[model samples]
Target: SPVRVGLSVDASALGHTIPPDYTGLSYEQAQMANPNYFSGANTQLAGFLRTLGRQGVLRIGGNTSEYTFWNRHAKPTAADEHLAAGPDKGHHAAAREVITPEAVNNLSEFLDKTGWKLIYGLNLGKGTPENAADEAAYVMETIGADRLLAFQLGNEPDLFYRNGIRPASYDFAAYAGDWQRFFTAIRKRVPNAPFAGPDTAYNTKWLVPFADKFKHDVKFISSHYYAEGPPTDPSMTIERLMKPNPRLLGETAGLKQVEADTGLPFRLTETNSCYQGGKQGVSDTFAAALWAGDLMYQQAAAGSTGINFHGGGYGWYTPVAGTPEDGFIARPEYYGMLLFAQAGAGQLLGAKLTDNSAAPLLTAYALRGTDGRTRIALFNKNLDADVEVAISGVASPSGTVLRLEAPRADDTTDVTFGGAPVGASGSWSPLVQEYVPGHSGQFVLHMRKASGALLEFAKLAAALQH
Candidate 1:
């Protein structure tokens, strides 16, 4: 038996209704490494999306967006030769490689098959408005206007000054001017091109200024975040990763203010555990899963409409690994998302942590489904101790528990939700569930260190029959 903590749930207190396509993935333009993955030709990839509800957003662009070019004329560059050189050489340093009609065609087909929409990023660095307009025209024509969520002009314009992509004097005013130029050009080609951006990495201050000036032109405010970075920094640890970062909430506060000011929803368009690919051990383990789940709920609670976790290829932070030929493997982060998808499907309900001392290590979220049942997600991020939660305010005779657990927070391979890993074929069947008997109109929950649970309480109507 684990040590105990008391919790309360106020069923009447409701929060945001989570959108159907709440979960999303962010991929680099370089995922063209296997164009088959986007063509719906890869069964494993298709299966994975199916397992994830198949109705989410797919953000196609990243640091690689600036390096990717539109291949309009079927003109082939020495792409093979360029990509064959040393790791840092090749496509990483290319002048321009074609974005190929095939890539767009495949992507369109993939989105159709997956029942997902797209937020496409166009290259702003080293890219002219004409080229972007051309690509935007072709994409709109090929993918269809209905399929696109929005067109993002750049990846992270705020970092342009620091990265030497723009002058030190560059500011929001300059960015807005350049953005209007691109928007005008793109609008010529795409008369109603839905746009979303000012995709800043750190400086969220750009959000309000951009939204204030072009609220009519933008659909949603967008930004990117990496909780910590460079991967080589020794300060990046599971401990630090688990510890709550006030900066995240602070940034969310800024975005919420922008939402209030402009009346447009905001999203964390590109985000992950760490920047520069991510640290291997920290990002690839169960701890990352807990961190990701907590981060998603935290942002959702703070008014973010959606979040896109960035990863693809063999990057350490990637949720799905392996090549198209070998099949893709779901990582711990994917399981974290699976937990979110399962537990957070309906209208969010407000949950209060009654025990202040244990609040730092434990976080909770409540939701009420359309069927009228209540689901509560409890996360225990403590590294070494188990916690017992005495849940109150809601009463049911029995509840079903879906446990997300692993051998330890650092364990990578054994991560499981409901006692099973997602199969290679993208099939998942949650086989482990415990039925807990209520005591005195309350249920006591035992949460192991670094684990989480989703408990479903039968609706009052159903419970009346029992």
Candidate 2:
């Protein structure tokens, strides 16, 4: 029984942004619209959402999303438009470039057509109650009430407070006050709108108090995480990106306790291996993919509702793609997501490690299928060594392989599975694969480091004669 597994990606992670210098060659419009090139501005998103049939939830806003939502869409009623400028000289007013009526309409249509619900984020910095209500109404009008799963009042108000955008004295209580105000106003217009709150980045302290106080108003508890941050800790780099820590640890456990206390599902709405953008060499490598695959499963096992990978199309650390044509190309982390989405099915069955030689270096999980067969996911992090394991519980049959391996942890372009490359390109293709019985009912799987392998065994049949 494999627990439900899912992947979360920022729309901005797929494509490139126009640099301020006006490099005429930059695909500014398309890049901003379809940053992680799933296909193109028109079709890629719909296809991307459809492809992830098991996707529990889709979060559309990130740093870029917040920038666009607040600075662009909310700027009309903004008390101070000058507050929109960022430290970077290239910062364009969101209103001037990113958030337009057309953009929101397109996003709503994509969400509607794909049957994927949204955790919509609003701009809190420059946005007023009126603006939040207006945006909420527009979303309801465009995507319908059912299409929206929940609404996040802002993206990382904690970070903003730290950055001096909001007052340093502006704690979560102040933030929650604003959130409640926004909720009250939106409720007046859209009575049935569901809501999620305390959309803090890397802060779990805000969870319990906010959820406890606003129990009826909040639907899900949300938070963001990046395992490593600033000057880039070398240990996080070596352990997560360069090599795997067999432990497969995540940042914090407080959020899980929040869920336990409040009874609301918790989500790592935004996360990646490295925080301040991403680690330059580590975050972009294939090793990141292996780490991600294991981490996503671990998060699911730890009782998380979702895990969204945070990549900036043009941010400080990691960007998923460098060009428009390669939009949404699988960076090392993307490769991990592709594999997990493919092999993760059924209920999460328990597994015991017979041999622990790969201790602190390998991550593993076992999933049981509807057919009574077990599929195990194994990850190797010893950049130079391949992990060979003997099998026991489930028999392995003559089945195809779906592996995500790269030449080196740092190599992003050379990702492959079963010695073949994996990609999201091409036309609509159904999930087509068959399974067969094993000779004795068990087989060993040798998973390569900086790589992952999925082993499946067919279930025993029930004869009519019996």
Candidate 3:
């Protein structure tokens, strides 16, 4: 028998509405150097961002968020003026960069054009709350609440001690104290300012306690995740990426726990396949695409409000990469998001998959739109096996499959979805759409090794039949 996978989707039992702005991208604050970089003027980048989804988020922060200081003057000063913009202890950019009022306005326009919101970060590592308050005021004034999601006080305060941003004695209590002070000052200036916090790195201990204390104070319980790390590890390979990530699983439990306990939404503020700049081949491969597609649904199920895939100016793991001057390219991981985008906005339906092949790698998720269309995602990461997924529960009158595939699992270039490479203008037109016919209220999808597909049924009953 063929490698058969069974999917049972429940339409009546609606799950989370994958937040409108669930798809997000994170950039280092250093990108602020070119204010036009995130503005509507960068039509190429804006066009590329639109491909992710009509509604999404853009998180501006990372290691460089520490180095960035909001300045009003053209010739501005940073808190760490002595530091230079070069490598220091593996940090991306140690020197301080400037972001001004014009930058904020440009960012506002960018968000408007792309239908995205901003989760702006304030420099909390070494900067004072007074400065952060001022920055928040200006951000709120410029971007306004419509385009702004919330203000994150810091990038990853838990990692501060090791990075020398804080003393080794600093703990959750100490971080909370700092956060409270920052919150008070910013709130005074911005008045009822929305906030998200803890933004911890590898420390899961901080998030639960954070949710406990700041449940009423924060809009999002935010944190970061990197499946593998340091980019220098020869051990971080494509095979490692395909395997289940224990840390991610652990984080999932904590995230869900927070959601159940506090009822406050949790967002994986930043995430990616690798950390510390990411592994060159591994982070840039088609394998990463499969990993991201799986992660998005996994987090959506885990109650993540949004996820920002962190990237610097040219990080290997950037979903969308390139400079405004040179132009942007949709990296392989973007195709993963592109697949998720094809699912569109709707209520998530509980989906269960049972596979006959013991060695098969398959993941299935279903989303039912306000309209009668049901979108099912099939991702097969098995390197040497093909999966024939028999989808049931939801009525499928007709459907089409948009394939996400590459020449090889580790292949970095020539990745395509809907059977065509993304154009330079950040537009992708599906050259091939495979028609999937339903048989007796059942639908089927075939996926090859190291690939995925988005199946959209044109007609479907609102109620799943017994």
C-alpha TM-scores of all predictions: 0.93, 0.77, 0.93
Rank list by lDDT: 3, 1, 2
Where does the lowest 10-residue lDDT sum fall in candidate 3?
79-88
Once fitted onto the true fold, the runs of candidate 3 whose alpha carbons sit more than 4 angstroms away are: 76-93, 460-466
Cα lDDT of all candidates, in order? 0.79, 0.56, 0.81
Q: Give the TM-score of candidate 3.
A: 0.93
Off by over 4 Å in 2: 1-41, 52-56, 64-98, 231-252, 312-328, 370-373, 395-400, 424-441, 462-466
As a TM-score, model 2 comes out at: 0.77
| Global local distance difference test of model 2 | 0.56
lDDT of 2 by residue, 328-441 (tens): 443556556656655645556555454455344666666654455556677776665566555555544444445666767777578765455534531222243334334554
Candidate 1 matches the true fold with a TM-score of: 0.93
Clashes (N, CA, C under 3 Å) per candidate? 2, 22, 0
Could you tell which candidate, 1 or 2, scores higher by lDDT?
A: 1
| Top lDDT prediction, candidate number | 3
How many backbone overlaps does candidate 2 show?
A: 22
Cα deviation in Å at residue 372, candidate 1?
Answer: 2.3
